[PDB]
Design a protein around this nucleic acid. Structure first.
Lengths: 89, 44, 275
RNA sequence: GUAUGAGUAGCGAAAGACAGGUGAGAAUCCUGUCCACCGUAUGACUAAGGUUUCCUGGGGAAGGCUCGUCCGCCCAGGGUUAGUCGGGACCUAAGCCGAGGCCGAUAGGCGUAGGCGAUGGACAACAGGUUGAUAUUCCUGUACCAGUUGUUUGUUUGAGCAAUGGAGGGACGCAGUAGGCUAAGGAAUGCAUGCGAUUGGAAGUGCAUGUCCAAGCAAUGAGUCUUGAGUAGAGUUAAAUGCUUUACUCUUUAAGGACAAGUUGUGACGGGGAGCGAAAUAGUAGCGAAGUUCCUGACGUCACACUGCCAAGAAAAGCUUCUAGUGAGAAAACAACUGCCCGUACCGUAAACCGACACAGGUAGUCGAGGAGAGUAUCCUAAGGUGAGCGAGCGAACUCUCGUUAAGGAACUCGGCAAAAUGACCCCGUAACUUCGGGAGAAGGGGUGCUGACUUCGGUCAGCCGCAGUGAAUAGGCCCAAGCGACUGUUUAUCAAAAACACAGGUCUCUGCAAAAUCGUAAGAUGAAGUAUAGGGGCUGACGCCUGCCCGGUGCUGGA
RNA sequence: UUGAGUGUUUAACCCUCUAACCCGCACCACUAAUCGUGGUGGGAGACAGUGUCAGAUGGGCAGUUUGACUGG
């Protein structure tokens, strides 16, 4: 559906270093492809993509007030470019 | 000194899991008796 | 011949074995083997229905021709081989069309003979014929009991039967064990006696070798407890404190007869002799 | 809920000491120096299992058998990247499920076609660098597999492609020695640096350290296995030029065919490398010498290759051919493009798994160095790891674990129980009895270090020293008689290991095959893809010599 | 369930037939099939198997019983 696929960017210290090699981190939808994410990114910014990489993240046990339960699941995709750039801030 | 419980992931699902309880007529007696009590886990 | 071992260990003292001198190769034909399993005496249900069986060496099944249906085409004998599934030896045979087959090896079969398998066949060892066409007094093996089904009767190592007489649609045979009988005159058999016959004289020698053959050990009824056997219990060694020693399931064990009294074959049996 | 026992038992194998940091506070946290422990493991890697325990910055109420500034604990943020690795889009074993079917008060039991199901088959990528935390996954260099686009002749079949059909193949046990290669190991050539402060040493013969490299591509190759052709016929459900086969003829150290560890080039003007070392917070960035010869040499690999034996050693797909075949015209050059889902942190001979515990127990597989040695034994060590989560004193009885003991030497006790004694290698010798194999390591005695000479070779002679030469550690006590069981084996998880069970051998009896016997209401099964030299049941129990009398009673069989 | 013919004796009995019933025999079709159903041969046959009733046998298995007084 190409506009519900990408959720938001990841902004951590390991992801700032990737922006200097032309790599961008997004939390994407669960039930999404390597190929589907690639299509969505090429559609929403007009770039050219080499190589999406993709991971799954486990939920974490948390415990606030004598009530415990897990956070969400997560999907993280890292998008490499040929030559162009996206400006997120 | 080997004790009785030796854990295994496949065996626990194959002997005690949802589909094994669904395939017999007495398994469904078990599942209904657990749903009638209010158990948060009705089948391993 | 029978081979005798020297007494170099206590497990060797009085053992004997086969020379394996009629066997000419040790590599079977590939297109005639199927798998087997070693049921070990267990049922459909997973239960032991026959005690004392299980767990020896692995075996592949050789397909035998017990029917002998290819007529008016000679077959040449190529090899005499070892079968793990029976006690007779076995022969690989080339028909001239180029069909291959295995066959039970009779006494005195040479590599090179050419066997024939119809009503106009000759009376030579190896040849198979319908019982109508076999004279009185020929030694015979591998006998059909129903037309077109396969030989069932005289099949183990060194056995034989004999033709006694003909009548309307039946032939009189004296089988191994000495029983006299009637068989339909349109059934088949092959001329000769079965082969490897010293087989009877082998002495197994130790308890491991009969474990290699798939046999598990046997406990006597009288060193059990009274809930396992009718012979179990008592203080000390005990005699058979009964009349007529019995099986684990009752049922006397010396001299008591167990065949069906309304057998549909009591018409055909002349002169029961040994059972 | 709270006492008594009572500030008592215990605080769960083991080596620390001091200086200096931090801090409200230090035997217990940090940094250093020396000392001590494991090293076929207490080192490195991994499959289960666990499930965030992993990294960074803070904290000290509870957990931690003491303490705590610390932590596998608590709070906040962050970490797991694949066309090629393991699993799916591939194959099948045991077993399981089973459209129709067959059986049965109900419920249901079984089973055909067809499927699921790895612990096995098949299957394309390597070496180095980089983070606080991932790497055959990121980066660098150089590859490979399957596709897609473009630029480089009659679907009859002599183009090409080709079966759910015919065939070949995949495709298999255990033991034993021999050979070849490579990893690993040892000793001396090259390097680089630097010369002893306690007597002595500038060194051909002196100390310390180091002493090399992939997949792919090309060339060849220690070696291993296998005879090959011609004609006349069978056959292979239709067809085959494919495959099987009978009869004849030539051929054999040969020829042909097939497979092969490794090596040498290239990859590589690259990488790594003893050390040297900053401009600041850095042993940091960055810059680097040399690549030898000889000895030993794998059960790792060639390869279950060769030999021998009996107990006679999976299946299916990928793969390769042949036609039948709906059937324009796809072969191969370059370029550039495409390639999905699941796992991937960390522990893993353990404080993270199974044992209620931070528990002297248990846990599949690969790697596993040196001296002396047959060795993965034994002692000490290398690479690596560790000092074990209560301490300081004193040096009573008693209990436990250890070492020594005059004279005697089983007088001890139910009983030599427990200790002590024997123990390695080489040589000499060695009884009765016996199933001729044994008994046998029978018993009983001698040698063993170091220097020199000769050494035919293996050793022998001359000399020297101590109480003692396998100078430590590791390693059979033996003999004469009698009972039971032939023997190797098995047994009361947790008071009984035996004379008990089993066993090879003996004998009696049942069973003619839809066998007897056993599971089941039945259907269906085992027996058995067996067929009386076979299968079931009872007793006895290697082997040697033998196995008396009784058929009245009771069972069994035959009778009329 | 279950039919048909001859003979031998005082109703019973020995037989012969083939169409029921049976086949863990062969070939054929449904068809990828050692199950099943149909078809044709062969074998066997009013026997066997199965239902109701009856007599034997039956520690294979089951439910129980096995007294009180008493210098214990």
């Amino acid at each position: 559906e190409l506009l519900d696929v990408i959720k938001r960017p990841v902004i951590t210290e390991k992801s700032m270093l990737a922006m200097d090699e032309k790599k961008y981190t997004f939390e994407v939808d669960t039930r999404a492809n390597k190929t589907l994410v690639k299509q969505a990114v090429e559609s929403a910014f007009d770039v050219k993509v080499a190589n999406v990489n993709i991971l799954n993240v486990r939920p974490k046990f948390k415990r606030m007030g004598k009530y415990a339960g897990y956070t969400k699941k997560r999907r993280k995709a890292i998008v490499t470019l040929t030559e162009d750039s996206k400006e997120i801030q | 000194m080997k004790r009785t419980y030796q854990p295994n992931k496949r065996k626990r699902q194959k002997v005690h899991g949802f589909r094994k309880r669904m395939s017999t007529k007495n398994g469904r007696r078990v599942l209904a008796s657990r749903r009638r009590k209010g158990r948060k886990v009705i089948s391993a | 011949a029978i081979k005798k071992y020297k007494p170099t260990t206590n497990g060797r003292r009085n053992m004997t074995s086969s020379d394996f001198a009629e066997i000419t190769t040790s590599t079977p034909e590939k297109s005639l083997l199927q798998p087997l399993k070693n049921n070990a005496g267990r049922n459909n249900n997973g239960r032991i229905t026959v005690r004392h069986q299980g767990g020896g060496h692995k075996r592949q099944y050789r397909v035998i021709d017990f029917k002998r249906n290819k007529d008016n085409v000679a077959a040449v004998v190529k090899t005499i081989e070892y079968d793990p599934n029976r006690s007779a030896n076995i022969a690989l045979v080339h028909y001239e069309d180029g069909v291959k087959a295995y066959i039970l090896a009779p006494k005195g079969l040479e590599v090179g003979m050419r066997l024939v398998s119809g009503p106009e066949a000759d009376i030579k060892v190896g040849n198979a014929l319908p019982l109508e066409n076999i004279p009185v007094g020929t030694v015979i093996h591998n006998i059909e009991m129903k037309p077109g089904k396969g030989g069932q009767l005289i099949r183990s190592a060194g056995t034989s039967a004999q033709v006694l007489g003909k009548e309307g649609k039946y032939v009189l045979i004296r089988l191994n064990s000495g029983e006299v009988r009637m068989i339909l005159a349109t059934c088949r058999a092959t001329i000769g006696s079965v082969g490897n016959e010293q087989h009877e004289l082998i002495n197994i020698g130790k308890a491991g070798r009969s474990r290699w053959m798939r046999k598990r050990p046997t406990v006597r009824g009288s060193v059990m407890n009274p809930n396992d056997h009718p012979h179990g219990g008592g203080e000390g060694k005990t005699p058979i404190g009964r009349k007529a020693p019995v099986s684990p399931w009752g049922q006397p064990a010396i001299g008591y007869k167990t065949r069906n009294k309304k057998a549909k074959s009591d018409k055909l049996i002349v002169r029961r002799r040994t059972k």
